[PDB]
Design a protein around this ligand. Structure first.
Ligand SMILES: [Mg+2]
Ligand SMILES: [Mg+2]
Ligand SMILES: [Mg+2]
Ligand SMILES: [Mg+2]
Ligand SMILES: [Mg+2]
Ligand SMILES: [Mg+2]
Ligand SMILES: [Mg+2]
Ligand SMILES: [Mg+2]
Ligand SMILES: [Mg+2]
Ligand SMILES: [Mg+2]
Ligand SMILES: [Mg+2]
Ligand SMILES: [Mg+2]
Ligand SMILES: [Mg+2]
Ligand SMILES: [Mg+2]
Ligand SMILES: [Mg+2]
Ligand SMILES: [Mg+2]
Ligand SMILES: [Mg+2]
Ligand SMILES: [Mg+2]
Ligand SMILES: [Mg+2]
Ligand SMILES: [Mg+2]
Ligand SMILES: [Mg+2]
Ligand SMILES: [Mg+2]
Ligand SMILES: [Mg+2]
Ligand SMILES: [Mg+2]
Ligand SMILES: [Mg+2]
Ligand SMILES: [Mg+2]
Ligand SMILES: [Mg+2]
Ligand SMILES: [Mg+2]
Ligand SMILES: [Mg+2]
Ligand SMILES: [Mg+2]
Ligand SMILES: [Mg+2]
Ligand SMILES: [Mg+2]
Ligand SMILES: [Mg+2]
Ligand SMILES: [Mg+2]
Ligand SMILES: [Mg+2]
Ligand SMILES: [Mg+2]
Ligand SMILES: [Mg+2]
Ligand SMILES: [Mg+2]
Ligand SMILES: [Mg+2]
Ligand SMILES: [Mg+2]
Ligand SMILES: [Mg+2]
Ligand SMILES: [Mg+2]
Ligand SMILES: [Mg+2]
Ligand SMILES: [Mg+2]
Ligand SMILES: [Mg+2]
Ligand SMILES: [Mg+2]
Ligand SMILES: [Mg+2]
Ligand SMILES: [Mg+2]
Ligand SMILES: [Mg+2]
Ligand SMILES: [Mg+2]
Ligand SMILES: [Mg+2]
Ligand SMILES: [Mg+2]
Ligand SMILES: [Mg+2]
Ligand SMILES: [Mg+2]
Ligand SMILES: [Mg+2]
Ligand SMILES: [Mg+2]
Ligand SMILES: [Mg+2]
Ligand SMILES: [Mg+2]
Lengths: 65, 206, 263, 158
RNA sequence: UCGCUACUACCGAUUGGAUGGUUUAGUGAGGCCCUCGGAUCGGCCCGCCGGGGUGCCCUGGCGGAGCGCUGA
RNA sequence: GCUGCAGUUAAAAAGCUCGUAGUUGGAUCUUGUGGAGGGUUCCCCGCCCCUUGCCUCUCGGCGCCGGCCCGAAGCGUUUACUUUGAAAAAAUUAGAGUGUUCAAAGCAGGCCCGAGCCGCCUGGAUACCGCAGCUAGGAAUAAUGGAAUAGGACCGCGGUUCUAUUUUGUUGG
RNA sequence: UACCUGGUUGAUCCUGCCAGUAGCAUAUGCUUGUCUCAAAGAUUAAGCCAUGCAUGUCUAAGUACGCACGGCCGGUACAGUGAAACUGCGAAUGGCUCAUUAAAUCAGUUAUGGUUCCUUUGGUCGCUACUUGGAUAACUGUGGUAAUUCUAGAGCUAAUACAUGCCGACGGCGCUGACUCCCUUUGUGUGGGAUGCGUGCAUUUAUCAGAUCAAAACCAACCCGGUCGGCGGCUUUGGUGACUCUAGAUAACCUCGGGCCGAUCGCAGCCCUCCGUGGCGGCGACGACCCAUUCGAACGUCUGCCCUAUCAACUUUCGAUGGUAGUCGCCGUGCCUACCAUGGUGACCACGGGUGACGGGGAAUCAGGGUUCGAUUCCGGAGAGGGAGCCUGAGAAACGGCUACCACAUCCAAGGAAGGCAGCAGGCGCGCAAAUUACCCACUC
């Protein structure tokens, strides 16, 4: 049981709630085609990082200057 | 074996508690000593940390003290008279702390007559002719006024104590645990303690 | 499960100011019994192989110590888990260098080379003053040392400077408001200042205030104060920074503006 | 208190000695019996009924062999039916976090009341100190009795 | 309501069974403690010899007696 | 369903009333300005009575021309509340630095010399850690209390009664 | 990202659920090119276990007559490497699992002024002696049994094993009081004193003191400023909030076989009213009574717990709550005994029952609040098939220790002997459900 290993890891993306939404589908395909990406996981990744940056910014923005 | 743990008791509400572990060793037994009177034997128990501990059986000599005089001597223990805890501890002559014992009273007489140059309770004087008046009425012109007349005035042993010295025994209380040390020490009763214990003894037996 | 004393220490449970990794292995040095407590000490193997890089494994520090090179407080220690602690003196005469274990500013020991003339005495905090048989006064210091016949005007919490070769208390500083001090426990582990106050709560944990050399004030318990000077004048040499505790913002400003990257 | 010898052994304070002395140092007014007492510290004052009066309580804080250290609590007296032992109740509020609201709770303590205090009756306020285990369910000792509230000991003319 | 198929639970002679958990009373292995016990093993005390001294003594060895005291 | 649900007819208010615990509980007990931080009144020092404040003396360091005086000792009936300090393992979580080739990770790493430096610089931060216990400011809100058959107060005295054990040099009547 | 969609009707508006939607973790189906990281017999059976391994250990410094080698010649503490065996230490750590356990464990908080502590570091070491005794291993030799890490008889020999026991340096004070010296005979105002007894720390009991307050007046006796009846003038370890604390004085006690005060081993050296011994000189190792420190352990304080009333009263000579004296214990304590009192808990949920309950740090989800999980690598607890009892030891109620009963099960020559994988691999069984009978001490310790 005791071992010199590390188990720290995380996911880097999140799937969308509405699975079949024509607008989301075609907007993410426009974005895949114009930047020559392989997957949509590669769009959900960037969406995740942008969402976390926004969360941190809004969190800092509610404190008093 | 025997255990001193708290977890076999009911809790304050009167509810049972269930055990979580088997009996440990820091919760031990080691049955009682029950010191009798007789020729000395002392066993030795090995306890937590090493630290041998002497368990007495059949003690017959103690180290008792007279607190008014500040005079302590080795003496023989003759019998047990009173015991505040139980009464079967006087029927079996078992000797525990705060017991009431008779002692031999002789070395205190010796020290007293030597220190004060004055007798104890004595009935008649013929034995004092070859010896003892030799100690008590020592043939010396120096000291025998100046020293022993300052010993006098103080030499006023109370009624009960001087009545004790006639039958040749005293009344003493043990102030040490013979089951843990192997020694039976104590102090001879005086004053209100003596009156209380004498009345209790007289009231119990007979 | 646990019928006696333990002898292993897990790497995750070791003190944090040792500044260890988490991938070398499951185990930590586990300092052996000594004059300093387990959570407040610094073993020899960690000081030699981790902070000084003289050794690279445990075998190398073992065979460095087995040559009578390392001296802690004058005497030659051969153990590699000896608990060296506060205000100690390390001496390696094969290279001619002496150190002194003192918390720097951030709650960890520093590497604080000192002059060989300063590596002769050490300051010690008095914890106990009792009388032995025949009425002989004794001392007990923060590193288990016992001194017989001290002058009968040194009391608890006072500091005594002792010669490392002979014991033999040399001088002493008194616990009073106005005396330099370094905090050796708690949250302000390393900061240096003057006393200026001592609050008293009979029955528990009399607290003491401190105010450093920039007008900042902070309190601690009396159990963590260590008088190291008469006032505005240390008796031992102070490390770089001098227990000032510049905040993270000033830290960033000084690290950026100075552009401390390399030479 | 004329006779404090009620058990089958002679009750007397330790560290007190009945010494050798002359006739008529007193036949009444000096009965040759001093009183051992100590001060508890922490600002608590030893009551005069422990210095003057006579009684044998080895578990009393002021004259017996016991040391007060640790916590100091307080409560109100609820029962006086044991010998030198009373039962006091401590009420408090427990804050639940789901709701933002408190709830009333109470604890009972068996505590030791020295014969030094003779004015106590149900309803007083009592301060306690922490001692070594004095029995199976007793660890505290009464240091001070107070009653300075409404419906006082009697009509307020003090 | 009566009738057909299928599924579920219930009452119940059987004085059912299995596994247990407490439990009156009776017995009770083994360890520990106490009071005894005494298979055996030594030492001390007396002759002959070897070694030392003044017919005797001291270490030792031999066979032994008194096996008397005695220790484990 | 605390924030946050429902009970005429969809599921739902006991037939009705009394009542101990539990939960909840009406109104009421000191105000302007001199200087000073933020405006042109208003929100740390003090004046209409008080505005840390009454004191009682005492020993320690502090004024001044043997004498003169304030800080030091109690503390403001208490609590809850609120703000602040102390003391609470690491790992994980949030978070600072760092181009693992990027990332998940990790605690590292960065420079200059032809090697002729037998080296130098620098990090391994910080936050959070409820409730209970410790600590010091605030006094709105909510609790609790004071003299109605009185006693607060001043060296007010009067009487009886106990006594501490210091000096009168010491030891004692 | 603080979100909704289909379904009762001929159609409408609602309540309300069923279904859809996204994550998370166990299993399973189909399919699988590269590379980094890495969970893995917890769920059910804390069911049963074939085989191998997982705990041993020597420096110059405890004992070397193995010819086991081996030297320049032999043993004159005797060469040197050194098997075996005695001795010392460790084996109470680590590893594994979660059956028990519901104010119990555990967490934060405090207390030992109520206890023990191998070792580490620092203090302490003087009230035949130029060195004592006998007796066991290994080794040699004879054996017994179907059988084991079985062991008996015979012959030798050591200690830092076992067991004894001085030497020095006391020039050590108090209590005793033969006697002895001036003037007051004496008492007392004076001064020597043989003689004897006890005389270190640690144990046990008893006792004593534990010092400094505010001033004066007479009387009996005394110091000094000085005088042959009286006036001014000294009072003395340490610490805590608090001890019956620490230290001091007195009288004894000793437990020996059952406290201490060194009959131990290794490196390298100097002066001799002087010819090897009279002498003395350093550096270590080991051991050891006591105190403190460190590492802890144990027992206590305050607060905090899932469901249940188809659990409302519970507890009590088979101690329940308290009081006094004791036994026992490392110590406080109904811990246990004797004698007394009649108490203690509860609607603020006591007491009883259930848990597919080990607690916590933590994990998943999450607008704000919350809900569910935590067998599992760090901390704490508990157990080694089920109960129970002990030895050694500083530390164990130890199972890689011992002794019994119960349940299983192995060998037998039937007399007897031997056992405990919830350690690492592996195997059977159980199941929907979980890996190699591999290599190495190179890293961490
Ligand atoms: Mg258990
Ligand atoms: Mg010991
Ligand atoms: Mg363990
Ligand atoms: Mg170690
Ligand atoms: Mg059917
Ligand atoms: Mg039965
Ligand atoms: Mg029986
Ligand atoms: Mg038996
Ligand atoms: Mg609804
Ligand atoms: Mg209807
Ligand atoms: Mg309806
Ligand atoms: Mg109605
Ligand atoms: Mg109101
Ligand atoms: Mg992180
Ligand atoms: Mg990162
Ligand atoms: Mg808090
Ligand atoms: Mg406050
Ligand atoms: Mg319909
Ligand atoms: Mg339709
Ligand atoms: Mg659904
Ligand atoms: Mg490739
Ligand atoms: Mg299992
Ligand atoms: Mg095997
Ligand atoms: Mg060898
Ligand atoms: Mg060792
Ligand atoms: Mg061992
Ligand atoms: Mg496993
Ligand atoms: Mg239960
Ligand atoms: Mg609790
Ligand atoms: Mg805890
Ligand atoms: Mg706790
Ligand atoms: Mg030492
Ligand atoms: Mg033999
Ligand atoms: Mg009792
Ligand atoms: Mg008792
Ligand atoms: Mg009742
Ligand atoms: Mg219950
Ligand atoms: Mg239950
Ligand atoms: Mg379970
Ligand atoms: Mg749980
Ligand atoms: Mg939330
Ligand atoms: Mg767990
Ligand atoms: Mg389970
Ligand atoms: Mg596992
Ligand atoms: Mg714990
Ligand atoms: Mg166990
Ligand atoms: Mg099993
Ligand atoms: Mg041992
Ligand atoms: Mg066992
Ligand atoms: Mg084990
Ligand atoms: Mg075995
Ligand atoms: Mg096993
Ligand atoms: Mg296995
Ligand atoms: Mg492993
Ligand atoms: Mg299968
Ligand atoms: Mg699987
Ligand atoms: Mg399978
Ligand atoms: Mg290794």
């Amino acid at each position: 049981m005791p071992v010199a290993r590390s188990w720290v890891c995380r996911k880097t993306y999140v799937t969308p709630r509405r699975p079949f939404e024509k607008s989301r589908l075609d907007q993410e395909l426009k974005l895949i085609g114009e930047y020559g990406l392989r997957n949509k996981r590669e769009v959900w990744r960037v969406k995740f990082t942008l969402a976390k940056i926004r969360k941190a910014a809004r969190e800092l923005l509610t404190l008093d200057e | 074996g025997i255990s001193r743990d708290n977890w076999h008791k009911r809790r304050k509400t009167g509810g049972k508690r269930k055990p979580y572990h088997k009996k440990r060793k820091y919760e031990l037994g080691r049955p009682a000593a029950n010191t009798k009177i007789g020729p000395r034997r002392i066993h030795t128990v090995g306890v937590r940390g090493g630290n041998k501990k002497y368990r007495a059986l059949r003690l017959d000599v103690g180290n008792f003290s007279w607190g008014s005089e500040c005079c302590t001597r080795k003496t023989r223990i003759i019998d047990v008279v009173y015991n505040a805890s139980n009464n079967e501890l006087v029927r079996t002559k078992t000797l525990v702390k705060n017991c009431i014992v008779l002692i031999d009273s002789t070395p205190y007489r010796q020290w007293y007559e030597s220190h004060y140059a004055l007798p104890l309770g004595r009935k008649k004087g013929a034995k004092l002719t070859p010896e003892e008046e030799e100690i008590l009425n020592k043939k010396r012109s120096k000291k025998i006024q100046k020293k022993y007349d300052e010993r006098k005035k103080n030499a006023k042993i109370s009624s009960l104590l001087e009545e004790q010295f006639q039958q040749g025994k005293l009344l003493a209380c043990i102030a040490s645990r013979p089951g843990q040390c192997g020694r039976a020490d104590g102090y001879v009763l005086e004053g209100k303690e003596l009156e209380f214990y004498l009345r209790k003894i007289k009231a119990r037996k007979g | 499960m646990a019928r006696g004393p333990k002898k292993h220490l897990k790497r995750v449970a070791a003190p944090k100011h040792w500044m260890l990794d988490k991938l070398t292995s499951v185990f930590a040095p586990r300092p052996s019994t000594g004059p300093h407590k387990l959570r407040e000490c610094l073993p020899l193997i960690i000081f030699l192989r981790n902070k000084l890089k003289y050794a690279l494994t445990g075998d190398e520090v073992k065979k460095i110590c087995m040559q009578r090179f390392i001296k802690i407080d004058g005497k030659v220690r051969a153990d590699i888990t000896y608990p060296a602690g506060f205000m100690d003196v390390i001496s390696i005469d094969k290279t001619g260098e002496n150190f002194r274990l003192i918390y720097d500013t951030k709650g960890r020991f520093a590497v604080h080379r000192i002059t060989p003339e300063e590596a002769k005495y050490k300051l010690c905090k008095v914890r106990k003053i009792f009388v032995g048989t025949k009425g002989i006064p004794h001392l007990v210091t923060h590193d288990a040392r016992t001194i017989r016949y001290p002058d009968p005007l040194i009391k608890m919490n006072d500091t005594i400077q002792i010669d490392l070769e002979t014991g033999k208390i040399t001088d002493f500083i008194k616990f009073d408001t106005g005396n330099l001090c370094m905090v050796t426990g708690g949250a302000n582990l390393g900061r240096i200042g003057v006393i200026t106050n001592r609050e008293r709560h009979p029955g528990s944990f009399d607290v003491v205030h401190v105010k450093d050399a920039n007008g900042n004030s902070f309190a601690t318990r009396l159990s963590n104060i260590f008088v190291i000077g008469k006032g505005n004048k240390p008796w031992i040499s102070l490390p770089r920074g001098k227990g000032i505790r510049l905040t993270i913002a000033e830290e960033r400003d000084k690290r950026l503006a100075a552009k401390q990257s390399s030479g | 208190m004329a006779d404090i010898q009620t058990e089958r052994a002679y009750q007397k304070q330790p560290t007190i000695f009945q010494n050798k002395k002359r006739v008529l140092l007193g036949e009444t007014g000096k009965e040759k019996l001093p009183r051992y007492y100590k001060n508890i510290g922490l600002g608590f004052k030893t009551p005069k009924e422990a210095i003057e009066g006579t009684y044998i309580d080895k578990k009393c804080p002021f004259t017996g062999n016991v040391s007060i250290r640790g916590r100091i609590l307080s409560g109100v007296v609820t029962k006086m039916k044991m010998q030198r032992t009373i039962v006091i109740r401590r009420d408090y509020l427990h804050y639940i976090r789901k709701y933002n609201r408190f709830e009333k709770r109470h604890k009972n303590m068996s505590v030791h009341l020295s014969p030094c205090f003779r004015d106590v009756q149900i309803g007083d306020i009592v301060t306690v100190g922490e001692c070594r285990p004095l029995s199976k369910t007793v660890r505290f000792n009464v240091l001070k009795v107070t009653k300075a509230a409404g419906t006082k000991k009697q009509f307020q003319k003090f």
